[PDB]
RNA sequence: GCUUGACUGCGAGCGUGACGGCGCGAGCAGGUGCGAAAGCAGGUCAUAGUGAUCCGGUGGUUCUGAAUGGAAGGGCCAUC
RNA sequence: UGAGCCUUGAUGGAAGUGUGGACGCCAGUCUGCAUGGCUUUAAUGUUUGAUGUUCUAACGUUGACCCGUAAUCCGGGUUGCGGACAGUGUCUGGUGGGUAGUUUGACUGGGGCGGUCU
RNA sequence: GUUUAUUAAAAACACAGCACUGUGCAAACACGAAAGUGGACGUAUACGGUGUGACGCCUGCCCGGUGCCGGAAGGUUAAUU
RNA sequence: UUUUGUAUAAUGGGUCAGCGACUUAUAUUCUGUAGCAAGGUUAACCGAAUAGGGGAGCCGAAGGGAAACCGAGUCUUAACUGGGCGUUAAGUUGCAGGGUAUAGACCCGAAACCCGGUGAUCUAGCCAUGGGCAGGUUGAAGGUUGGGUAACACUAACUGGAGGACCGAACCGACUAAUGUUGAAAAAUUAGCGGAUGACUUGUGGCUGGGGGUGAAAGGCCAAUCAAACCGGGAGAUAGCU
RNA sequence: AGGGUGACAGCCCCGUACACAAAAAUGCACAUGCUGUGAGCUCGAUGAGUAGGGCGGGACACGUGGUAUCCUGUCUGAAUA
RNA sequence: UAAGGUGAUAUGAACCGUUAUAACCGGCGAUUUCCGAAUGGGGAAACCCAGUGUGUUUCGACACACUAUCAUUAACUGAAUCCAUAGGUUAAUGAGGCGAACCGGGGGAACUGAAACAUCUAAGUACCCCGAGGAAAAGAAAUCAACCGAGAUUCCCCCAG
């Protein structure tokens, strides 16, 4: 699917709009890098496709506070 | 990313100490392993007195060695037999070990550490002012006198 | 020789254009210059020497300015 | 190794007798290692960028095992290798008939050529 | 040998041979938004692309222009600050 | 019909019958007409529904200036002159018609463009698995022996049987001529012709999809279609032309 | 009203206004039973990778324009009645 | 409900009813082959092959029934690795696929008009795709106003071409 998984950040669509204002359909893909996360509490080195910034959240909230929803949200993981 | 160090952590770690760092260092090493932890308030606030548990909880409660300066000082006439030695010298060896537990009958037992005698007290009879060394700062007022039989 | 009329505001009424425009103009008002004065001067003896609009630039202005005071911006005049 | 900030030097506890540097009105010398009675540049910390090193712990492995599993996929683990490189996302200079949409004037003794266009 | 089924069978294409050029393997390159796959269960005596076209004798001079290769010290130069 | 001009040998019509083209909506402006008149009229909606209510609002009774502003004046200007535009204009709301605007805008008609699907039962490659090739000829490499040599070369018989080899049916192809050309046939028939153990030919099924495939390269082939297939849609594309 | 009956019918026929009709099955208003919901009051608390921001785009009638406001892919990042 | 009936081309035959369920009409059920999401596996749809059980049986087995996948949950199992997960089994529920328009969302043309054509227009239209209900969406101000105030959203007419 190519989603942020943690922020659901999917690839949006826009226009290149180069010089001369020439319109050209495109799309803005997120970041994602599938990071190795150590929940520790669960003693499991869980992994999942995240995305920069959207990953800065996993740190500000907590691998747990994050997985809080996610899993609860139904997301596999 | 600040997090609280949990050990050596080279040029920054100080144990139970929190300092700045990089997210690349944390959530990749400083943490996943056992060397830090996020500074989400609780990590500090829920531990504000954690350091006071000793610098307070375990600091003022300690006054046993101190109370000696007054208690081990309120003794009535302190003197220890040092066995005379023909008007002058002595026969026995009265120094620290003695003026640091000469109270066995009173049950007020102690150690030979609490003593006030830099050097061995020559075999004389002078006012053996061997206070309690048990406490550093506030020592005590323990004496004794060279006696004999 | 002396000067700056190659001035500013307007203009009876005409010529020429499909139109946008282009041209001629006595006289009026303010101030100028030449002449004793009558007067002449609103560029060159005349007919070529040139680009609409838009979009912006520059100086001016108490015209406007989205709650009010300002300001950006807009208009008006000059001009690129 | 430049960039700066902090602190410490040179302009603006007693001589005299060996031995460094710092440019030079040199008719200069100033400043350091044995003996004798607040502007310009330099170090240390320091934070910041730049080269280039080594490390592992992200990240890669289409090396070797193990388990799912009587599976040359996939997933988790062990180890080896590589390593903040590679790669990807946003932005950004170049290149880009590979692809795409279009333009490429009128007069004219037919059209073109030539010439013309106020 | 092949070719315009249905006006062209040829002097056209292909060919064996030749030369240049790329590619060290997760190859170059190609299909694909990706995963994956062909190349190849191959590995430079190999694979792709280009031009020439058995074989014999040969294959001269020009690097100014265009392109490709190598250098990049210096001039100019993007986002960024 | 189209033309400067047609009996024109310039277009269209074999004939008949039925069908076949300036409409419709909202707006705007005129003209006729009706109502009311410095006033005219409501919209939605309510509704004892074509009534009645509702005057939100629209137009008109004042214009000038770029405007602030001013006002039968107002701008222009220092101008308190002149000049421009205004002031001694009846408007408004229905109804019918003329014209315009927006829409398919009288009707019919492209060659194309874009989107989503259907097609490799024809054909082009390729994949897997089966089949076919009467007869006749040529005689390579290798070899056994005789000779030959220091030994090898070398050589001669016989043996052996190669080859995008030779002749020629089936089979595959398509060089020539005739005939056919409203055919027997939307590419054939007849007489010749080329390849015929190979880059051969063929059955069965499979994979490549449209700006894509495939191609021993002709723009050839991709279902009698190809300089971008076919079907449905955008769509009544647009058509200063007929 | 309308329809039929051997030509056009209020009175031939079926209907027609009108008046009534449901074992059952359900739409929906209410009405209440059970399960779930939890009112009500006192004292609280009052929505952070968020608002803003830089870069690329998109939405607003508004084509970056002097251009607010809204969403953002990408990098950041606050006050806290 | 009622004297007529066995739908039609369809007569005929053979019949059922003339008071009270003959036929016919509406309610509610019983049955309901095979294909088809198609669901036991497979497959050129309407056919082919299996497992485990049974009503039975003369007990050959005749058929019939249950067995897809995923999600949540519960129980029982249970690897690399002590634990622990992953994986597995079972049961329970729920989904699955049809659909005319309307609606929310994801992606999104060109012809065309500009008398050419890029910006611009056609148009967020055609079209494809996911989802939902009888409505969907939206909705109780970090909204407007303008120093007076109004008071969520939605639809209508004005504002105004
Ligand atoms: Mg002249
Ligand atoms: Mg082109
Ligand atoms: Mg076009
Ligand atoms: Mg011409
Ligand atoms: Mg030949
Ligand atoms: Mg031909
Ligand atoms: Mg031929
Ligand atoms: Mg050639
Ligand atoms: Mg040649
Ligand atoms: Mg040559
Ligand atoms: Mg003619
Ligand atoms: Mg004729
Ligand atoms: Mg007729
Ligand atoms: Mg042959
Ligand atoms: Mg032959
Ligand atoms: Mg023949
Ligand atoms: Mg075939
Ligand atoms: Mg064809
Ligand atoms: Mg259209
Ligand atoms: Mg089945
Ligand atoms: Mg099935
Ligand atoms: Mg056009």
Curated annotation (Swiss-Prot), chain A:
InterPro entries: Ribosomal_bL28, Ribosomal_bL28/bL31-like_sf, Ribosomal_bL28_bact-type, Ribosomal_bL28_sf. The keyword Ribonucleoprotein applies. Signal peptide: none annotated. GO terms for molecular function: rRNA binding; structural constituent of ribosome. GO terms for biological process: cytoplasmic translation; ribosomal large subunit assembly. Part of the 50S ribosomal subunit. Belongs to the bacterial ribosomal protein bL28 family. This is Large ribosomal subunit protein bL28. It comes from Escherichia coli (strain K12). The gene is rpmB.
Curated annotation (Swiss-Prot), chain B:
The keyword Ribosomal protein applies. GO terms for molecular function: large ribosomal subunit rRNA binding; structural constituent of ribosome. Gene3D superfamilies: Ribosomal protein L9, C-terminal domain, Ribosomal protein L9, N-terminal domain. Disulfide bonds: none annotated. One of its GO terms (biological process) is cytoplasmic translation. The gene is rplI. The modification N6-succinyllysine is found at residues 71, 83, 112. One of the primary rRNA binding proteins, it binds very close to the 3' end of the 23S rRNA. PROSITE patterns: RIBOSOMAL_L9. Part of the 50S ribosomal subunit. In stalled/collided disomes (pairs of ribosomes where the leading ribosome is stalled and a second ribosome has collided with it) bL9 in the collided ribosome contacts bS6 and uL2, while it contacts only helices of the 16S rRNA in the stalled ribosome; the inter-ribosome bridge thus formed is different from that formed between normally translating ribosomes. HAMAP family: Ribosomal_bL9. This is Large ribosomal subunit protein bL9. Keywords: Acetylation, Ribonucleoprotein, Ribosomal protein, RNA-binding, rRNA-binding. The keyword Cell membrane does not apply. InterPro entries: Ribosomal_bL9, Ribosomal_bL9/RNase_H1_N, Ribosomal_bL9_bac/chp, Ribosomal_bL9_C, Ribosomal_bL9_C_sf, Ribosomal_bL9_N, Ribosomal_bL9_N_sf. It holds the Pfam family Ribosomal_L9_C. The modification N6-acetyllysine is found at residue 89. GO terms for cellular component: cytoplasm; cytosol; cytosolic large ribosomal subunit. Belongs to the bacterial ribosomal protein bL9 family.
């Amino acid at each position: 699917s190519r989603v942020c998984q943690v922020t659901g950040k999917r690839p949006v669509t826009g226009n290149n709009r180069s010089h001369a204002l020439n319109a050209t359909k495109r799309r803005f893909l997120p970041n994602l890098h599938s990071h190795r996360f150590w929940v520790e509490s669960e003693k499991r080195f869980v992994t999942l496709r995240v995305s920069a910034k959207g990953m800065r959240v996993i740190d500000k909230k907590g691998i747990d506070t994050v997985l809080a929803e996610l899993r609860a949200r139904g997301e596999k993981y | 990313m600040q997090v609280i160090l949990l050990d050596k952590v080279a040029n920054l770690g100080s144990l139970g100490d929190q300092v700045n760092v990089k997210a690349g260092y944390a959530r990749n090493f400083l943490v996943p392993q056992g060397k830090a932890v996020p500074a989400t308030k609780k990590n500090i606030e829920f531990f504000e007195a954690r350091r006071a548990e000793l610098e307070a909880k375990l600091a003022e409660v300690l006054a046993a060695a101190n109370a000696r300066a007054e208690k081990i000082n309120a003794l009535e006439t302190v003197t220890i037999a040092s066995k005379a030695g023909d008007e002058g010298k002595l026969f026995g060896s009265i120094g620290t070990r003695d003026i640091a537990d000469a109270v066995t009958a009173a049950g007020v037992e102690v150690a030979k550490s609490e003593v006030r005698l830099p050097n061995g007290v020559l075999r004389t009879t002078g006012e053996h002012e061997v206070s309690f060394q048990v406490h550093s700062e506030v020592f005590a007022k323990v004496i004794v006198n060279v006696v004999a039989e």
